[PDB]
Write an enzyme that holds these catalytic residues in place. Structure first.
Site, PDB file in Angstrom:
ATOM      1  CG  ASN A  73     -17.846 -30.793  21.897  1.00 47.78           C
ATOM      2  OD1 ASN A  73     -17.036 -30.829  20.987  1.00 47.78           O
ATOM      3  ND2 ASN A  73     -18.984 -30.101  21.821  1.00 47.78           N
ATOM      4  CD  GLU A  85     -16.864 -21.181  10.565  1.00 53.25           C
ATOM      5  OE1 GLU A  85     -17.589 -20.521   9.788  1.00 53.25           O
ATOM      6  OE2 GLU A  85     -17.308 -21.790  11.564  1.00 53.25           O
ATOM      7  CB  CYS A 134     -22.049 -19.724  17.709  1.00 51.02           C
ATOM      8  SG  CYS A 134     -21.148 -18.372  17.265  1.00 51.02           S
TER       9      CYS A 134
END
Ligand SMILES: *[C@@H]1O[C@H](CO)[C@@H](O[C@@H]2O[C@H](CO)[C@@H](O)[C@H](O)[C@H]2NC(C)=O)[C@H](O)[C@H]1NC(C)=O
EC number: 3.2.1.45
Length: 497
Positions: free
Chosen positions: A370, A235, A342
């Site tokens: 996905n 990130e 998450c």
């Protein structure tokens, strides 16, 4: 061979209790003959990847939704499925008795389990660590002579990995990612908050950081662990935020671009680990397609990037077409890989909800999304966490497929574990997503793929309360008359030859 010992904790479904002497497992894989199909079913009512079979006829007795496999419409080839071996996870796992430990590792990596073939490894500490630290905290050591792996690595992570690989069905790929670098290489001298690398790409700050990667790979190599790939930074957009709570390191797409171009890429390429793949982004999908554009339209940077790693927070929205879809459209030859997922992130959500069906549904629905949008792999976060969703040194607790109750030498496999298994166990490396058209509007989420050997695998998720009768048609073998029970998830498999 052993079923799920259910246990309810007050949510929509049950979790499966496992301990030192018992844990639900599968029997060795059996491949049904042509004309018959295998079905693994999991339901909110309590079913957990139960195996059943049926016939693929030539009679089409169905009169409702029809999903027709389109084997000739080929898409991306699957890299794999897995989760992260964070400090938190190794800690919870090694806190169970040796026998419970192996049953837990087996649940994930064994064929009696759900066959994970991917393990993400944090490069030093993150928030799922009990302390902040890096591999080189000795100030201003640009030569990195005081680079070394702490106990979290040599005592917790490396030994659990050797063991997971040792029990692993299929080959496992290791993916590495750093959260923050030594604070003395940062503009703010702190593992967290807003600060990036000091100086500009090409300098000593940047050359040292890139070497830190090689040092790391040398360290793990010394421990007989090779990596399939590393990310540019976990990130990177986090470090651009003032007040960011935990280990991070800001980079703007531009910074990342040049960093990879001038430092990371060259350094890796010129080392003994040159075959290790490099993934860019490793951040939330809403930063796409933009980040891809910036980094990839620069050939000096793009020659080094093998794929774009993406993250996502299931509790949040992030239309896939505008993000993953567009990115593929602009860089069709640069793979998309999911590196972190998450649930229970939003402040009001209970970190852990033992037996939550909603959370399972979210996981599979996310893997389907996905897979429908070109992603070649999907990696979960912490392999296991305690009942509070920790340990997390900044109390950034979330949920995990497996919850460990150290006081009872017990671990619980949550609905998410099974939703992940419905994919991970039946979509081996090299599987290739193929087409699958619906005859009409339906509330199901489905995806078909073809194994390397040519066999079929369709995953059907029903996030609705009502049962949806349906037929799957494979033009090379026939029709599969079946039903998608409300709040369920099935995986179908069948030979085509
Ligand atoms: C681990 O879990 C198993 C499964 O629940 C426990 O074994 C069961 O124990 C009950 C009560 O003693 C028996 O009636 C069952 O016959 C057992 N089932 C099986 C298949 O063994 C076991 O006690 C647990 N282990 C520990 C240490 O508590």
């Amino acid at each position: 061979a052993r079923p799920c010992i259910p246990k309810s904790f007050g949510y929509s479904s049950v979790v499966c209790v496992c301990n030192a002497t018992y844990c639900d497992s599968f029997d060795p894989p059996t491949f049904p003959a042509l004309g018959t199909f295998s079905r693994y079913e999991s339901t909110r009512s309590g079913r957990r990847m139960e195996l059943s079979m049926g016939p693929i006829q030539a009679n089409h007795t169905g009169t409702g939704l029809l999903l027709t496999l389109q084997p000739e419409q080929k898409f991306q080839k699957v890299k794999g499925f897995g989760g992260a071996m964070t400090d938190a996870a190794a800690l919870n796992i090694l806190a169970l008795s040796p026998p419970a430990q192996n049953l837990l590792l087996k649940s994930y990596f064994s064929e009696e389990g759900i066959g994970y073939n991917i393990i993400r490894v944090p490069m030093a500490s993150c928030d799922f660590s009990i302390r902040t630290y890096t591999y080189a905290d000795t100030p201003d050591d640009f030569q990195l002579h005081n680079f070394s792996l702490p106990e979290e690595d040599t005592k917790l992570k490396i030994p659990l990995i050797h063991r997971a690989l040792q029990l692993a069905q299929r080959p496992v790929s290791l993916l590495a990612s750093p959260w923050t670098s030594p604070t003395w290489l940062k503009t703010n001298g702190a593992v967290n908050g807003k600060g990036s690398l000091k100086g500009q790409p090409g300098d000593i700050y940047h050359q040292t950081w890139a070497r830190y990667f090689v040092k790391f790979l040398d360290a793990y190599a010394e421990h007989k662990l090779q990596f399939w790939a590393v990310t540019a930074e976990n990130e990177p957009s986090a470090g651009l935020l003032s007040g960011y709570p935990f280990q991070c390191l800001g980079f703007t797409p531009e910074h990342q671009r040049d960093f990879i171009a001038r430092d990371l890429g060259p350094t890796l390429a010129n080392s003994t680990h040159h075959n290790v793949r490099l993934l860019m982004l490793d951040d939330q999908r809403l930063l796409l397609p933009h980040w891809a554009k910036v980094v990839l339209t620069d050939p000096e940077a793009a020659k080094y990037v093998h794929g774009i790693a993406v993250h996502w927070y299931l509790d949040f929205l992030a239309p896939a077409k505008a993000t993953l879809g567009e990115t593929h459209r602009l860089f069709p030859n640069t793979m998309l890989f999911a590196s972190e997922a998450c649930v229970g992130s939003k402040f009001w959500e209970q970190s852990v909800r033992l037996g939550s069906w909603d959370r399972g549904m979210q996981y599979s629905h996310s893997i389907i999304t996905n897979l429908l949008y070109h992603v070649v792999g999907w990696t979960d976060w912490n392999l296991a966490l305690n009942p509070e969703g920790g340990p997390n040194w900044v109390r950034n607790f979330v949920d995990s497929p497996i919850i460990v109750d150290i006081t009872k030498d017990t671990f619980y496999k949550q609905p998410m574990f099974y939703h992940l298994g419905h994919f991970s166990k039946f979509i081996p490396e090299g599987s290739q997503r193929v087409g699958l058209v619906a005859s009409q509007k339906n509330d199901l989420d489905a995806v078909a793929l073809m194994h390397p050997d040519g066999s079929a695998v369709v995953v059907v998720l029903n996030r609705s309360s009502k049962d949806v009768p349906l037929t799957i048609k494979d033009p090379a073998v026939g029709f599969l008359e079946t039903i998608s029970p409300g709040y369920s998830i099935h995986t179908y498999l069948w030979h085509r030859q």
